[PDB]
Structures are given as structure tokens and as C-alpha cells.
Amino acid sequence: GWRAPSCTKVTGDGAVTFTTDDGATLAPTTGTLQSVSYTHGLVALDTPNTLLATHNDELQRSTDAGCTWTKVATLGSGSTWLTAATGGRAFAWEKNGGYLARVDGRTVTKLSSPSADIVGVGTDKARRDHVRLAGSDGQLYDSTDAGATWKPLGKLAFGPGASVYTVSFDPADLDHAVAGGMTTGGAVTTDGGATWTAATGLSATAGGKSNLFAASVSPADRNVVYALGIDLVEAAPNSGAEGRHLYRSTDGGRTYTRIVDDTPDTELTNSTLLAPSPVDPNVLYFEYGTYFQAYGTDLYRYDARTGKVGKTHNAHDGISAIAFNPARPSVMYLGLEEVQI
Amino acid sequence: DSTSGWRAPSCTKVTGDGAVTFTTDDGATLAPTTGTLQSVSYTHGLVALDTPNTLLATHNDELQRSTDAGCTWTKVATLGSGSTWLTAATGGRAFAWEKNGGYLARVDGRTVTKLSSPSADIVGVGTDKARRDHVRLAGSDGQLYDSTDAGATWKPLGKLAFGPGASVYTVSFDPADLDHAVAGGMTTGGAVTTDGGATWTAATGLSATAGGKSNLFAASVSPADRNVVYALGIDLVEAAPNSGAEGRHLYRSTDGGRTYTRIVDDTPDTELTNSTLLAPSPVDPNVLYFEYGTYFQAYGTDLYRYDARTGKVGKTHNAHDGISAIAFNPARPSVMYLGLEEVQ
Ligand SMILES: [Ca+2]
Ligand SMILES: [Ca+2]
Ligand SMILES: [Ca+2]
Ligand SMILES: [Ca+2]
Numbered sequence: 001g002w003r004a005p006s007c008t009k010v011t012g013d014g015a016v017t018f019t020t021d022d023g024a025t026l027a028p029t030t031g032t033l034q035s036v037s038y039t040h041g042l043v044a045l046d047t048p049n050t051l052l053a054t055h056n057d058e059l060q061r062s063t064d065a066g067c068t069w070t071k072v073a074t075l076g077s078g079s080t081w082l083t084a085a086t087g088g089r090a091f092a093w094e095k096n097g098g099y100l101a102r103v104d105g106r107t108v109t110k111l112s113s114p115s116a117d118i119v120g121v122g123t124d125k126a127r128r129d130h131v132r133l134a135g136s137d138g139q140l141y142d143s144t145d146a147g148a149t150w151k152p153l154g155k156l157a158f159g160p161g162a163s164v165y166t167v168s169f170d171p172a173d174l175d176h177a178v179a180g181g182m183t184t185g186g187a188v189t190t191d192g193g194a195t196w197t198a199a200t201g202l203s204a205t206a207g208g209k210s211n212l213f214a215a216s217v218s219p220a221d222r223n224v225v226y227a228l229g230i231d232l233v234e235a236a237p238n239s240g241a242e243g244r245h246l247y248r249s250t251d252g253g254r255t256y257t258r259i260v261d262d263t264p265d266t267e268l269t270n271s272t273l274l275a276p277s278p279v280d281p282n283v284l285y286f287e288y289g290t291y292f293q294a295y296g297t298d299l300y301r302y303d304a305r306t307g308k309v310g311k312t313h314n315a316h317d318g319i320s321a322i323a324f325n326p327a328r329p330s331v332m333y334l335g336l337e338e339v340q341i
Numbered sequence: 342d343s344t345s346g347w348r349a350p351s352c353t354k355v356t357g358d359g360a361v362t363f364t365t366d367d368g369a370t371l372a373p374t375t376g377t378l379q380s381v382s383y384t385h386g387l388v389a390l391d392t393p394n395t396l397l398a399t400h401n402d403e404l405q406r407s408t409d410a411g412c413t414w415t416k417v418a419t420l421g422s423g424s425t426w427l428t429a430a431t432g433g434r435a436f437a438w439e440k441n442g443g444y445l446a447r448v449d450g451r452t453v454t455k456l457s458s459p460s461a462d463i464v465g466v467g468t469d470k471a472r473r474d475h476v477r478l479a480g481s482d483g484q485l486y487d488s489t490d491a492g493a494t495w496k497p498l499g500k501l502a503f504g505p506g507a508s509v510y511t512v513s514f515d516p517a518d519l520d521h522a523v524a525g526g527m528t529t530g531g532a533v534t535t536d537g538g539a540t541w542t543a544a545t546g547l548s549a550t551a552g553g554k555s556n557l558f559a560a561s562v563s564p565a566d567r568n569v570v571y572a573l574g575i576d577l578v579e580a581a582p583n584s585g586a587e588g589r590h591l592y593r594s595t596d597g598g599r600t601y602t603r604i605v606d607d608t609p610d611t612e613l614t615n616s617t618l619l620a621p622s623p624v625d626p627n628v629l630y631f632e633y634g635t636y637f638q639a640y641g642t643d644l645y646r647y648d649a650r651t652g653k654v655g656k657t658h659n660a661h662d663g664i665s666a667i668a669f670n671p672a673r674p675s676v677m678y679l680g681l682e683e684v685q
Contacts, residue, residue: 040583079583096582237441238385238424240616240663240682241635261637264609271585290586292606318585337585 001048002327005065012069015039015055016062018325018333022285023299023312026334033316039335041082042321043090051323052090052103053335054080059092061106065325066333072106075099081321083121086128091147093118096136102147114141114150122169122177132174132192134167138181140193154193158184168215170222170252178225178253180212183232188253201256202247208233216274217253221281225249227256228272244268246286248304260286260302266309267298275322279329289318291339299334346393347672350410357414360384360400361407363670363678367630368644368657371679378661384680386427387666388435396668397435397448398680399425404437406451410670411678418453420446426666430468436476436492438463445478447492459486459495467514467522477519477537479512485522485538499538503529513560515567515597523570523598525557528577533570533598546601547592553578555588560598561619566626570594572601573617589613591631593649605631605647611654612643620667624674634663636684644679 007027010017014033017026041054049065057078060069077099080092090103093113100113115135124130129146138157141150157164157179170176175192178199186199202210209232218224227247235243246260246268262268267288277283282304289297297319301310318337325331350372355362359378362371386399394410402423405414422444425437437446437453443461447454460480469475474491483502486495502509502524515521520537523544531544547555554577563569572592580588591605591613607613612633622628627649634642642663646655666680 038583038585094583238616239383240614240618240665241684242614242616261635263635263637263640264612264633264643265638265640267609269585269587271587273585288609290606290608292608293610295608295610298609320585 002325003049003065004325004328004331005067007067010067010069012060013055014336016042016053016060016066016069016333016335018066018331020331021312022301022310022332023314023334026314033336033338035338035340037336037338038079039320039337040095041080041092042323042333042335043082043084044323044326044333045084045088045090046086047088050088051333052082053321054082054092055335059103059108073108075101075108076110081121083123085123085131086125089128089146091121091123091131093121093133095119100133100147111147112150114152115139119164120167120169120177122171122174124174125172130174132169134164134177134179136164138162138164138167138179140167140177142192154189154191155196157181157187157189157193157196165211165213166215168217168225170217171219172222176217176222176252178215178217178227180215180227180229182211183209185210185229186212186215186227186253186256190252197254199249199253199256201249202227202229203231203233205231205233211270213270214272214274215253216276218276218281219278220276223250223252224276224281225253225256226274226276226284228268228270228274230270244270246272246284246302248284259304259307260309266300266311273319273322277329278324278326285322285332287319287322289316289337291317291341294341347670348394348410349670349673349676350412352409352412355412355414357405358400359681361387361398361405361411361414361678361680363411363676365676366657367646367655367677368659368679371659378681378683380683380685382681382683383424384665384682385440386425386437387668387678387680388427388429389668389671389678390429390433390435391431391671392433395433396678397427398666399427399437400680404448404453417448417451420444420453421455426466428466428468430476431470431473434473434491436466436468438466438478440464441481445492456492459497460484464509465512465514465522467516467519469519470517475519477514479509479522479524481508483507483509483512483524483526485512487537499534499536500541502526502532502534502538502541510556510558511560513562513570515562516564517567521562521567521597523560523562523572525560525572525574527556528554530555531557531560531572531574531598531601535597542599544594544598544601546594547572547574548576548578550578556615558615559617559619561621562598563621563626564623565621568595568597569621569626570598570601571619571621571629573613573615573619575615589615591617591629591647593629604649604652605654611645618664618667622674623669623671630667630677632664632667634661634682636662
């Protein structure tokens with residue numbers, strides 16, 4: 001049922017638009033985005049032509065593949081991420097906060113998160129009531145009643161006393177997850193947290209420490225993981241080297257290789273958004289944007305076939321979220337930021 | 342009757358190993374060097390001395406000297422540290438010290454006197470222009486120390502800049518007044534003393550939020566105006582999680598370090614890091630030079646020039662991996678000496 005958008009202009013408040021050319025042009029929106037705005041929540045659902053977004057605390061829905069956006073509800077948090085689930089369902093959650101809710105069509109059920117500091121959420125494609133969640137100590141939690149109740153699952157990803165930035169769940173297999181921590185680098189599980197294996201390759205120095213700020217298992221190939229981190233040995237004081245790179249694993253998160261470096265031409269931060277292509281395992285989108293000096297936003301496209309990074313530029317202050325049209329993934333939905341300087 | 346003081350370099354190429362060159366046009370062109378800088382190299386130490394046409398540099402562990410305004414560089418000695426910074430004193434003297442280390446030595450002409458630092462984690466050194474043998478030093482706990490015998494012996498001076506358990510990225514001394522110093526802390530923002538650390542005023546303006554936490558990584562008092570201070574920091578409130586904002590800016594004070602205003606933001610056109618080198622003009626209080634460089638994708642080095650008259654930043658670009666130190670010709674400050682980096 002899914003189709004490409006049958007429009008060139010979007011009817012909505014300006015928080016969500018789309019591009020058909022990797023950001024070279026953005027569809028005009030009827031509304032003008034107002035400061036202060038972030039759009040951290042944006043997903044395509046399995047339901048044909050249906051998307052959800054959260055613009056600040058406003059949950060929005062489109063049922064015509066992004067041509068029209070309408071308010072559904074106001075959520076109890078002003079900064080939520082979305083994770084799609086089977087059957088017109090999604091989970092809304094505050095990254096590094098405690099807010100957690102379930103969306104069923106347009107109905108919102110606020111849940112009791114088992115963690116006050118959520119760093120990842122994953123859903124079971126085969127079992128729509130099955131959902132997992134990670135806390136910032138590296139503990140995974142499991143629910144089989146659509147998030148109504150929760151049990152701890154498995155062991156801590158890096159053992160006790162660790163600070164975990166992120167857990168990315170393989171969309172094809174919730175038993176497969178990657179964790180990124182402070183000084184502890186990366187870890188990977190394939191048995192739902194029963195055992196964890198430390199990743200290598202995030203430092204150019206054997207056994208070197210690193211921060212793994214963000215990770216994303218490719219929906220295109222369970223063996224491909226994209227990551228953002230700092231090699232703490234490379235970032236030795238007085239070196240003046242930041243040590244910040246993007247990385248790629250091709251063995252499911254066991255070993256990583258540097259693929260992009262933090263430069264003015266490929267600008268990285270500790271918060272760079274990672275958007276792997278859902279169909280091409282070679283392709284990673286990422287972005288940089290700032291309102292300062294009205295610099296605008298760079299939308300980057302990495303392709304592992306050559307290792308090269310292309311970029312387009314637009315005038316918005318940032319892109320907070322990216323989703324892909326399932327029928328034509330070259331159509332990309334962009335959730336936008338506007339901050340008044 | 343003539344004196345023969347400082348002059349601009351009377352040469353077109355530099356005879357030396359390639360760690361130090363000069364520019365007459367803010368980095369648009371760099372003087373060629375006879376030698377080719379080799380990996381792995383950093384030149385963290387570089388100063389112009391008071392003595393006519395004399396400079397010192399440290400290229401890794403090699404102390405180097407020039408007596409012809411940078412046209413010829415020769416080895417002086419191998420130092421006990423491979424990463425040292427230089428602070429000029431009067432006449433022919435400088436102090437060599439390892440930032441965030443314990444190595445400390447005095448250079449007089451070509452003579453190196455190894456000293457015993459009162460701190461194993463040095464974050465700042467300042468010299469007294471009026472008293473040749475008077476020097477001060479800061480440790481990473483925020484303690485200042487005082488020596489009146491050219492660094493041979495030391496006594497603690499004043500109180501900790503921030504207090505117990507609050508460590509310090511830097512202490513910058515006013516070159517015109519060793520009683521005036523700026524301290525930069527981890528989450529504790531900035532402080533300033535005008536009485537040699539007896540009292541410390543907490544700075545404002547490093548966070549856009551009143552009382553907000555911040556990191557003050559680097560600070561430099563203008564040699565052209567004791568009230569002008571340039572600084573590198575992160576506004577930790579602005580850098581809130583999920584905001585995506587890095588919170589990193591350059592700042593300027595016009596009251597000696599009591600209050601700061603943002604002047605430059607971290608963008609691809611004005612690239613900042615937690616280690617951005619700060620080099621205020623020695624003669625124009627409006628002008629600050631700073632640097633960004635990386636060898637990744639052979640990006641090279643941007644040398645930036647901020648001017649408070651207009652608020653604008655200009656830049657030049659060169660192909661080196663980085664500029665690790667900057668000094669100015671005292672007689673002709675548009676002549677700038679650059680210490681360079683090279684990494685495989
Ligand atoms: Ca960067
Ligand atoms: Ca704007
Ligand atoms: Ca930067
Ligand atoms: Ca090089």
C-alpha cells in the first residue's frame with residue numbers, strides 16, 4: 001500500500017518535510033517552523049502511508065505519506081524519540097529521561113519505564129507486544145505485554161559502575177544489541193544480554209579506551225553497525241587531536257573501522273545523528289547543523305563502496321530526525337529544528 | 342649613536358629543520374624552510390625574547406634558538422621532556438615547562454638549568470617584567486606558587502582558585518602584572534585574581550544561564566590591554582543532552598576576566614575544539630588569532646584572525662597538519678612566527 005508522496009508541497013506546521021534528492025531540495029511546507037522547536041520523533045509505520053512525529057510535545061500523524069501532517073495529541077514530555085512497532089504502533093520515549101508511552105493508532109498510553117535514564121528501545125517485528133528497553137547503567141529490560149510491565153533481562157553490558165550512552169537493537173533480532181559507554185567503548189550481545197563481548201577497533205591503540213556515543217544497527221544488513229565515538233588515546237591531552245570519528249562494523253559490532261573523521265568538511269559532534277539506509281548496507285546518512293551565524297545544516301551521505309561522503313546544505317538550524325519512505329527509500333522525511341538567535 | 346634592536350627577518354627562506362617558520366601576511370604565505378618537518382613532530386614551545394632578534398623554540402625534546410629574528414635556527418640542547426611550552430622572562434631568559442606535567446627548566450642564552458617544580462601537574466607560568474628572578478607557577482589544583490630566585494626555590498602563594506577537589510585546566514598570568522591571573526576550571530567556570538591569589542572573583546558570562554556551570558579550557562590576557570581577556574570554553578547548560586548544541590565558544594572580557602561575552606561560535610567556518618590555541622595580538626587589544634588543523638583527509642590548517650572592531654573572523658589556510666605555537670616579532674608584530682605540527 002505504501003507509495004511515494006503525491007505532492008510537492010507539505011501541509012503542516014513546518015516541523016516535517018521531505019527530500020527526494022538527498023537534501024538538495026526540501027519540499028516547501030505551508031507552516032513556518034517557530035523557535036524553539038525540535039522534532040526528535042519521526043518514524044514511518046508499517047501501516048500504509050502512515051507516519052508519526054513529535055514536534056516538541058506535539059504528537060503528529062500523516063496518513064498520506066507525508067503530504068499532510070495533523071496533530072494527534074500532546075505528550076507529557078517535550079522531547080521524545082519514536083520507535084515503530086508492528087501493527088500501527090509506536091513507542092515514544094525521552095532519551096536520557098524517564099518518559100515512556102505507547103501509541104496505538106491515535107491512542108496514547110503512558111507507561112512506567114523500568115529506567116529513569118533510557119538509552120535505547122527496540123521492538124519485535126514478529127511479536128508486536130514484545131519490546132525491550134535499555135537504561136544508562138547498561139541494563140536491558142524485557143516486556144511481553146506491550147510495555148505494561150517490565151523485567152530485567154541479562155547482565156550489565158559493561159558490568160557495574162559504567163555509564164552507557166546508547167544501546168542500539170538490531171531491528172531484525174532483539175537478541176542482537178550494541179552498547180556504547182564512557183571510556184568502556186563498545187560491546188555487543190547476540191543472546192539478549194546474557195553475555196556481552198567487548199568490541200575492538202574503536203581505538204587505533206590495542207586495548208585503548210574510547211567513548212562510544214551513538215550506534216545504529218543497519219536495517220539493511222544485521223552485520224553492519226554504524227557508530228560515533230572518540231578514541232581517548234588519540235585524544236591525549238596536548239595533542240590537540242579531538243579523536244572523534246564515525247566507525248563501521250561489518251561483523252555485527254565485534255570489530256570497528258574508522259570511516260569518517262571530524263573535520264570542517266565532514267563535521268562531527270558527540271551527538272551526530274546516525275541514519276543508516278534501510279535498504280543499502282553501504283550507505284549512512286548523518287547531519288551537522290547550527291543556528292549560530294545562520295550556518296544552516298549539512299546533510300551527509302557516506303557510501304562504503306568508495307568510502308566517500310557527499311553533502312547537501314539547507315538553511316534550517318538542524319535536522320533532528322530522519323525516516324525513509326518504505327516504497328521508495330530515496331524519499332527521506334526530515335524532522336527539523338528552529339532556534340532563535 | 343645606534344643600538345641595533347629588533348628587526349623584521351632579513352631573509353626570504355628559513356634555515357632550520359622546518360619546525361618554525363614565519364609569515365608576513367597572517368598565514369597567506371609561509372616562508373620556505375631548508376628542512377622538511379618529520380612525523381611525529383610538535384612545536385609547543387616558541388617565544389620571542391626581549392634581547393634583539395632572539396627567539397627560542399622547542400621541537401619535541403629539542404630546544405632551538407635563533408639570534409637573527411628567525412632566519413637561522415640551531416639546536417641548543419635536548420630537554421628532559423618531549424613536550425614543553427616556553428615563557429619568556431626578561432633579557433635572554435625563558436622557562437620551559439611541560440603542561441600537565443612536572444618538567445621545569447630555565448634557559449639563559451644557550452644554558453639549560455633543570456629546576457624542581459613545586460607542582461607535578463603544571464597549568465601556567467608567568468614572569469615579572471620588572472624583576473628578572475621573579476616567576477610564578479600554577480598547579481592543576483588551582484594553587485599558585487612564587488619564586489624570587491629564578492625558580493630555584495618556591496613557596497605557595499595565595500589560596501586555591503576554586504577550592505578543594507576542584508581541578509583547573511589553566512591559569513593565565515597577565516604579562517604586565519603577575520598579581521593578575523585568570524583560572525579556568527572543570528564545571529566551575531572561570532575565576533580572576535588581582536592580588537596574586539589572595540582573593541578570587543568568580544567570573545560570569547561563560548554560561549548564558551545565571552550561575553550555570555561551564556568549562557574554561559584556555560585563557561589569554563592581552564599584552565595590549567590588561568582588561569582584555571580571550572577565552573575558550575563550553576557553556577554546560579547550553580550543551581544540555583538532546584539539545585545537540587556543543588556549547589563551545591570563544592569569549593572576550595573587557596574587565597580583566599570578571600565578565601565574559603561570547604564572540605565566536607564553533608562552526609565549520611570558525612572551527613573550535615577544546616584545545617584551540619589562543620594568540621592575542623601584542624599591540625591591538627581588538628585582535629585575537631586562533632588555529633584549527635588536522636591531518637585527516639589532509640585537511641590542513643586554518644589560521645583565524647578575529648577583530649573586535651567588526652566582530653568578524655578572517656582566515657588563511659596552509660597545508661600543514663597544525664600550528665602548535667605562535668609568537669610575534671616585537672618590533673614588527675605583523676611578522677608572526679609559527680611552530681608547526683606533522684603527524685603521519
Ligand atoms: Ca566537530
Ligand atoms: Ca533559524
Ligand atoms: Ca568544533
Ligand atoms: Ca602532513
